[PDB]
Nucleic acid binder design. Structure first.
Lengths: 162, 434, 83, 73, 82, 80, 106, 95
RNA sequence: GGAUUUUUGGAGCAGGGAGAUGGAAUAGGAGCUUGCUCCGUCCACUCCACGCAUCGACCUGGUAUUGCAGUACCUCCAGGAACGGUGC
């Protein structure tokens, strides 16, 4: 089913558990990721669980948002233009997807303000020194996989991949 | 990918439709002046479409230059013919009709019923392009220009008529200094005048007219276009005379004239060009600026009601005799008593007879039907919606009891020796077993 | 007549509110007593004095003139006024 | 025009905040609906550590931002 | 007429007297038009103090906030009825 | 007679009011009151040290307006 | 009838390259054991094939885009306006002549 | 009513609003000191008890420091200025 | 229905000094471009009084809590100060 703004104008943007402005895409299976700016700068968290989104891309220029929930999707690639469209985001829960390669984390450094993300239940995790690469290419992040970043992981992230 | 056949035919059809749509837009008349300006803008959009097709087609000579030899072969043919037949021998099970090849360009380059709008002409209008101080080509928006000139000059004795006379003359003795920042305000005034002159006519050659004005500024403006009989030639930017043409040729390519001044032939170029463009625009719309001054004077001289209006732009019923009824008859029949019915949309019935008949009349029967309640004698004298819905609950329950649900109440014989509803018995009967 | 905002404040009395005064005084506490002049006398309030040095006082009383803001109980979202 | 609900505060010491960064302690003694408060044994403590007792004051509601009660009343 | 009721029930950014904003769904108004906002957040500017530090806007949570008539300057509609 | 009654003689009048919050706010206001409540539409609002941002619907009060400006070809006599 | 439209366009294009009324790729393509059911003049689709051939032959003229460039209609809203006014005037004259003919018929 | 409007006219003609009285009788220009040092030079079109000031031929000036303060000005001919921002309204300015 | 709590406003204004410190690719004047010489707007670093003190989140480890409930805000030491606003 094509992803349009009927499921946006009917979707709920409300005061979420963290007291933000969260717009739900629960029960959507939307395979095309576009046309979100119709939130009109009254949103902070975009929850899109149960989406047919094969990738993480197609986001408009949104200025003040804080969190993007891509849970239960089919993410194969990672699109590069993330921070120029979401400059003030801090949380990305893109866990339970088809992440495998270290190059699937390539845009992950563009976020200056990224602090919290979740990429669990993704095959990119069984890779050795994976959180090392994550806290390496991402220095600003502190909350990594339900565990705060630390000087040990930081020194090990700066040491390897020299 | 027949770069000469398919592309040539599609472009030819598109350009033909564009020319026909321009012919139709020019053959239809205009009724509101905004309608005329919007028709001009739509004709500009259609001509732009035809020109874009023309430019897309004018480059189609790099593959045509290679295909001119192979397209003219009298020996080849049916081989590639049968090959294309095999490629087009895919499944034609798409049992559907579609006239959307050439009837679609007609609906894209056409007009509309609530407003004359084409396919690309659905969002183009004079609403974001015409000013309400003008009206899409009625008046001029120059109040901002008067406020800006007054803020630049700092004078409390500056009226609109004196400003308009200073701005209307073609090359007269200025009121503000050209080496001052009022030339900056003249730059914005020239920009606004050029934007108004261009938005007044989207059909006239914009590139060609700008090119003619630029050639004029290059060849006839900076070469003594206003001659004399120092008075023989004057400089437009530097404000210096020339004794003769040789003196002017010596004083244009000199050292002080080029960059030895803030009013030299290097710095004052954009200012002189904007001033010449503003003068040319005033001369081209000298009747238009004059009509705008006419509207401003009419607003300043009219009365206040006209200024606002210009800115904003017996006791008894009839009978079969044909005359009213005696007032005692009106009272005797109770026609002075009003009865309201909520089910009838709060309609007021006059007198007891009309209010008794209305329970059988279409208006009450329709109100009952909208509530999902059958209009029956049980609802006689019910006027409130809440009473009708309630009464309905009890009546539904009662008819519920008197009616006998056979399947819901019948008792059937379980073969072991049990009793269960006939509906369950038949269901289970089939239900693998019973 | 009576302002529906002031009715929301009177429905916001007895429970925890959070006023914010003109000098930035943020007083989050039990709004004991309020009147038509918005004069909010509250108890066990946490008054932050705009400094981030937030202290806890009891029987505080801020007038209505300084009230830049006042967070009332959001549990009054179904109050009979708005509906 | 309704007078304020300040009667339980009467005959009690409060620590009030008047505008301009003024803070004084004072005895709530009487007023009008205009919230003009009568503070007996009033002592004003300035922005510095020094404090000057002014004793008996009639203070405007136009400067007073709020007041805490030093007793439970 | 009591116009703002034609903008009632929807999300508006209401202006304060000190330069900030409060984004909340308007409930209703009064004679002095004082505000009661449901689901309200406050957008407050954070001073850069430098040309090398950027200007940010920090947001507070209020919810049901009774903004006294001393705050209302101008109010825009920012989100549809929820 | 107060001139709030004169300003009440306005609806769809292209005005530029300078509000007390360092703002220049221009538009064809919707409807005015006796307390000078001037509610704007198609509003171009620029604050003190701010951009000419756009508001689709705004309701500006009276005590927050420091100056007003009516259009150019407007009769003050039978507007007051 | 999209496959039929493709076939009609292909017939017009492949007849654009023939040399005479009998010298084309369709004269023998009819008897070449492949169904060509539009070339018959009793089928009204022969008019559609002839219109496709007319369009191909009007685009394969020297001004159709073979070795020349169209510049008066391609950057000339003045020439476009002259042509549109001439088409509207020819339409008005055609309607006026038609009205004269209709008055004659009445 | 009638006599009450007449008492209002008496207050405006022989009270402290004599500046507005002259400005509306002989059509003189008054310098209005706005609360933020905005100097307004122009005649007064109508006035009220609350000093709501509708004015014609107005110019608004201030000193904007970009340092040395330079005298920024604008010329707003017609203007309505309610009596809220007025610090003083001076009937005869020297210029 | 402009005189102490809401709509005729108490608002507005300006970021402490200085050293042969540094930029203004496209925008300063004047010494009648380029080069040099001075003056009226910023930041980045050093110095003086990191403008000071505060508390509030925050980051680095260690450190104590296994605990059923509707919330300003909750363990302790420590340092750096990336942030908030309060008196001078």
């Amino acid at each position: 089913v094509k992803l349009t703004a009927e499921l946006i104008e009917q979707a709920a943007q409300y005061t979420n558990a963290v007291r933000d402005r969260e717009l739900d895409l629960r029960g959507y299976k939307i395979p095309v990721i576009e046309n979100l700016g119709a939130t009109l700068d009254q949103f902070d968290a975009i929850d899109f669980s149960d989406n047919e989104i094969r990738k993480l891309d197609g986001f408009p220029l949104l200025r003040r948002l804080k969190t993007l929930l891509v849970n239960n999707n089919r993410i194969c690639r990672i699109g590069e233009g993330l921070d120029q469209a979401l400059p003030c985001l801090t949380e990305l829960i893109l866990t339970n997807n088809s992440l495998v390669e270290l190059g699937d984390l390539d845009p992950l450094a563009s976020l200056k303000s990224l602090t919290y993300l979740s990429i669990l239940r993704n095959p990119v995790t069984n890779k050795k020194h994976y959180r090392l690469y994550v806290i390496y290419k991402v220095p600003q992040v502190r909350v990594l996989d339900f565990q705060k970043v630390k000087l040990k992981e930081r020194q090990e992230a700066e040491k390897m991949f020299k | 990918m027949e770069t000469i056949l398919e592309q040539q035919r599609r472009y030819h059809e598109e350009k033909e439709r564009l020319m026909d749509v321009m012919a139709k837009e020019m053959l239809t008349k205009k009724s509101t002046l905004r309608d005329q300006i919007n028709s001009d803008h739509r004709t500009r959009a259609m001509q732009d479409r035809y020109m874009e097709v023309s430019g897309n087609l004018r480059d189609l000579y790099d593959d045509k230059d290679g295909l001119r030899k192979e397209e003219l072969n009298a020996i080849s043919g049916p081989n590639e013919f049968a090959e294309f037949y095999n490629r087009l021998k895919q499944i034609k099970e798409f049992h559907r009709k579609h006239p959307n090849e050439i009837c679609v360009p007609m609906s894209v380059e056409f007009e509309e019923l609530l407003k004359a709008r084409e396919n690309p002409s659905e969002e183009a209008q004079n609403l974001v392009e015409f000013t309400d101080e003008e009206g899409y080509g009625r008046y001029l928006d120059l109040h901002d220009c008067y406020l800006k000139y007054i803020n630049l000059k700092a004078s409390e004795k500056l009226d609109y008529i004196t400003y308009l006379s200073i701005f209307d003359q073609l090359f007269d003795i200025p009121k503000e200094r050209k080496n001052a920042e009022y030339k900056r305000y003249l730059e914005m005034l020239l920009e606004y005048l050029q934007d108004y002159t261009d938005r007044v006519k989207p059909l006239q050659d914009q590139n060609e007219l700008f090119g003619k004005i630029q050639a004029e500024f290059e060849k006839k403006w900076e070469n003594g276009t206003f001659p004399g009989w120092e008075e023989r030639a004057q400089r437009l930017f530097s404000t210096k005379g020339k004794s003769l043409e040789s003196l002017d040729t010596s004083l244009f390519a000199k050292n002080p004239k080029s960059k030895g001044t803030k009013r030299d032939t290097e710095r004052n170029k954009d200012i002189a060009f904007l001033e010449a463009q503003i003068y040319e625009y005033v001369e081209i719309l000298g009747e238009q600026r004059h009509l705008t001054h006419e509207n401003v004077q009419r607003k300043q001289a009219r009365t206040g009601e006209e200024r606002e209006e210009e800115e904003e732009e017996k006791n008894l019923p009839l009978g079969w005799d044909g005359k009213p009824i005696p007032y005692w008859l009106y009272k005797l029949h109770g026609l002075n008593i009003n009865y309201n019915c909520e089910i009838c949309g709060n309609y007021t019935y006059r007198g007891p007879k009309a209010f008794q008949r209305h329970f059988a009349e279409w208006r009450h029967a329709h109100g009952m039907r909208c509530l999902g309640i059958p209009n029956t004698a049980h609802f006689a004298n019910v006027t409130q919606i809440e009473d009708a819905v309630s009464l309905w609950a009890k009546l539904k329950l009662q008819k519920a009891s008197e009616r006998w649900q056979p399947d819901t109440e019948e008792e059937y014989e379980d073969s072991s020796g049990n009793v269960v509803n006939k509906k369950t018995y038949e269901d289970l009967k089939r239900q693998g077993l019973l | 007549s009576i302002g529906v905002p002031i009715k929301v404040l009177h429905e916001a009395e007895g429970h925890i509110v959070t006023c914010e005064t003109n000098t930035g005084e943020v007083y989050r506490g039990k709004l004991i007593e309020a009147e038509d002049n918005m004069n909010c006398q509250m108890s066990n309030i946490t008054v932050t004095y705009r400094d981030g040095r937030v202290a806890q006082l009891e029987q505080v009383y801020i007038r209505g003139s300084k009230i830049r803001f006042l967070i009332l109980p959001d549990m009054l979202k179904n109050a009979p006024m708005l509906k | 025009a309704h007078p304020p609900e300040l009667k339980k505060f009467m005959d009690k010491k409060l620590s009030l905040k008047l505008n301009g960064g003024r803070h004084v302690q004072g005895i709530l003694r009487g007023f009008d609906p205009f919230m003009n408060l009568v503070i007996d044994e009033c002592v004003e403590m300035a922005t510095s550590g020094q404090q000057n007792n002014i004793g008996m004051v009639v203070i405007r509601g136009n400067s007073i931002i709020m007041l805490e009660a030093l007793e439970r009343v | 007429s009591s116009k703002m009721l034609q903008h009632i029930d929807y999300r508006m950014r209401c202006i304060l007297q000190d330069g900030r904003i409060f984004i909340g769904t308007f409930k209703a108004f009064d004679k002095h038009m004082n505000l009661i906002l449901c689901d309200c957040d406050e957008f407050r500017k954070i001073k850069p103090k430098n040309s090398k530090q950027a200007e940010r806007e920090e947001k507070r949570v209020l919810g049901l906030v009774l903004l006294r008539g001393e705050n209302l300057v101008s109010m825009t509609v920012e989100g549809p009825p929820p | 007679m107060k001139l709030v009654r004169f300003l009440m003689k306005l609806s769809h009048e292209t005005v530029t009011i300078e509000l007390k919050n360092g703002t220049q706010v221009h538009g064809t206001i919707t409807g005015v009151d006796v307390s000078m409540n001037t509610h704007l539409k198609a509003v171009k609002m620029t604050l003190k040290n701010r951009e000419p941002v756009q508001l689709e619907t705004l309701s500006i009060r009276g005590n927050n307006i420091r100056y007003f400006i009516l259009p150019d070809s407007l009769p003050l006599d039978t507007l007051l | 009838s999209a496959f039929d439209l493709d076939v009609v366009k292909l017939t017009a294009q492949f007849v654009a390259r023939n040399g005479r009324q009998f010298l084309t790729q369709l004269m023998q393509k009819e008897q070449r054991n492949y169904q060509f059911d539009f070339l018959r003049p009793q089928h009204s689709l022969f008019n559609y094939f002839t219109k496709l051939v007319e369009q191909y032959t009007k685009i394969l003229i020297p001004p159709k885009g073979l070795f020349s460039k169209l510049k008066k209609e391609a950057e000339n809203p003045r020439e476009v306006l002259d042509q549109v006014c001439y088409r509207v005037e020819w339409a008005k004259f055609q309607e006026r002549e038609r009205k004269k003919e209709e008055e004659e018929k009445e | 009513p009638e006599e009450l409007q007449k008492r209002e006219e008496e207050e405006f003609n022989t009270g402290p609003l004599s500046v507005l009285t002259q400005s509306v009788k002989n059509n003189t220009q008054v310098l209005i000191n706005c609360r933020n040092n905005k100097k307004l030079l122009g005649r007064v079109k109508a006035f009220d008890r609350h000093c709501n000031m509708v004015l014609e031929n107005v110019k608004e000036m201030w000193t904007e420091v970009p340092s040395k303060p330079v005298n920024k000005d604008r010329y707003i001919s017609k203007m309505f200025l309610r009596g809220d921002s007025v610090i003083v309204v001076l009937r005869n300015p020297l210029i």
